[PDB]
Amino acid sequence: GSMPALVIKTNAKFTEEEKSKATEELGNIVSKVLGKPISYVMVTLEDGVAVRFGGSDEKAAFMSLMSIGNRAVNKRASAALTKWFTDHGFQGDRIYIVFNPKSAEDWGFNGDTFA
Amino acid sequence: SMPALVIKTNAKFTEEEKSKATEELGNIVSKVLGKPISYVMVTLEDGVAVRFGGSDEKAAFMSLMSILNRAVNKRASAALTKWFTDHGFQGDRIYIVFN
Amino acid sequence: SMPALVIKTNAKFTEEEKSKATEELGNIVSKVLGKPISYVMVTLEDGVAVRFGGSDEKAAFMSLMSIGNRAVNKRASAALTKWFTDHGFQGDRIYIVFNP
């Protein structure tokens, strides 16, 4: 799981400072669970999004975790990312996490691809 | 058969900057993919909270969806990244994912 | 097994307009994918800068994420497009991509 990117959407409304802290902390979580250095970790966080999950528009979050190229790692990543949100008052079953792995030739960085 | 380019950045653009970006980046995609000019869906969200390499310096995330190959992906990465480096972004803070 | 519909538009919606849209579009996903609404995620972003066919006229982009066929995809496209055309969008400015 190299070059990971975590894209987050939530209907919660965060201050600018809350988002700055969130991208740091969620990025550090990604770095830790995937065993990748923080220098390649990308995090995007969009708040104030209209979200409905299970028919309810209560607080919820949608996340996609993308990376270059695992049952075990996915479970640890799901748990750790979900814990950041439950630590901030979200119900865990309203945290939707999807994983999108990619081949090196499908990842652009620094104007090139790693293939 | 029409590609889609989804763009997110923590940079803040004026309306004219957004208008020019979706036109120019859309035309880059059309040209590199061998599609007609304007035959592309482009979305651009600015002011997004972004962190890359631990830093909240200006950065951009792009997803390019086309119903692509190793060679075309490299040309697309270079051409899209050049647009951003020409507009003040660091080349190593541009992530492009191909689908 | 939990589908997600991600919507972006350059239209501007009120909070009440967004609430109604996520409800009705989510109900369409439930029906066309044959999944209970408890499994369906909908996100909606308005005020997005969009260009489609070279034009920044009112338009909507949708990505439907669900594990998996031509037949269901055709019905999904038709039903989701009808919601937008019933709510003031031009049909040829509705773009839907499927990600299995």
Author numbering:
A (entry chain A): 12 to 80, 83 to 128
B (entry chain B): 13 to 79, 82 to 113
C (entry chain C): 13 to 80, 83 to 114
Paste lines from the article.
The six monomers include two with 115 amino acids, two with 100 amino acids, one with 102 amino acids and one with 99 amino acids. The hMIF-2 structure has an inhibitor, 4-IPP, bound in the tautomerase inhibitory site in the amino-terminus. The N-terminal residues of His-TvMIF obscure this inhibitor-binding site, which is otherwise accessible in both hMIF-1 and hMIF-2. The obstruction also explains why pyruvate does not bind in the expected tautomerase site. The location of the density is different from previously identified MIF pyruvate-binding sites, which are always at the His-tag-obscured N-terminus. We checked whether another molecule from the protein purification or crystallization solution was bound instead of pyruvate. However, pyruvate matches better than MPD or glycerol. LigPlus analysis reveals that only one amino acid, Asp68, interacts with the pyruvate. Furthermore, Asp68 is not conserved among MIFs. Further analysis is required to determine whether this newly identified pyruvate-binding site is biologically relevant or merely a crystallization artifact, as suggested by CheckMyBlob.
T. vaginalis evades host immune responses by producing homologs of host proteins, including cytokines such as macrophage migration inhibitory factor. T. vaginalis macrophage migration inhibitory factor (TvMIF) helps to facilitate the survival of T. vaginalis during nutritional stress conditions, increases prostate cell proliferation and invasiveness, and induces inflammation-related cellular pathways, thus mimicking the ability of human MIF to increase inflammation and cell proliferation. Thus, TvMIF facilitates parasite survival during infection and binds to the human CD74 MIF receptor, triggering epithelial cell inflammation and proliferation pathways linked to the progression and pathogenesis of prostate cancer. The production, crystallization and three structures of N-terminally hexahistidine-tagged TvMIF (His-TvMIF) reveal a prototypical MIF trimer with a topology similar to that of the human homologs (hMIF-1 and hMIF-2).
